[PDB]
Design brief:
part of a larger assembly, 2 chains, about 50 residues, about 15% helix, binds a molecule of 4 linked components (NAG-NAG-BMA-FUC), binds 2-acetamido-2-deoxy-beta-D-glucopyranose, viral protein/immune system, spike, Spike glycoprotein
């Protein structure tokens, strides 16, 4: 995880990487906030 | 026909979505995901 070059090296299981383009991992946008949306009802259920 | 569409499927995201528990369970099967990604990449290069 140090840098893309080291990620490429560690994906190929080798300390030397030849000329070319290598698929290493995937970029993904992490979420920022948690949103909960429940109905406006408040009357408790008659479980008792 | 000369070539077909070059497709690539992320094995981890397809099998497990964005769940870390599923990824940890997926690691129990070895390197299946690596083999599948490798084969698809080889097909993609062969099209060019
Ligand atoms: C079974 O019944 C008990 C007792 O309830 C009492 O008698 C019943 C037949 C009804 O007439 C009830 O209206 C009456 O209270 C239930 O216990 C009661 O539960 C309510 C709801 O949580 C309690 O109310 C709360 O009390 C706390 C502390 O006093 C305060 O934050 C508020 O007053 C809040 O509303 C109430 O105190 C409690 N009553 C007794 C006597 O403890 C019980 O819930 C029910 N069983 C089940 C499964 O729900
Ligand atoms: C919740 O209740 C009604 C719908 O039942 C809605 O119009 C109202 O704005 C809501 N109130 C709050 C405080 O969000």
């Amino acid at each position: 995880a140090l840098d893309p070059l080291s990620e490429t090296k560690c994906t190929l299981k080798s300390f030397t990487v030849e000329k070319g383009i290598y698929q290493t991992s995937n970029f993904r946008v992490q979420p920022t906030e948690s949103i909960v949306r429940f109905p406006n009802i408040t009357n408790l259920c008659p479980f008792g | 026909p000369v070539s077909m569409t070059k497709t690539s499927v992320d094995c981890t995201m397809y099998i497990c979505g964005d769940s870390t528990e599923c990824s940890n369970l997926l690691l129990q099967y070895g390197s299946f995901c690596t083999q599948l990604n490798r084969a698809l990449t080889g097909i993609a290069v062969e099209q060019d």
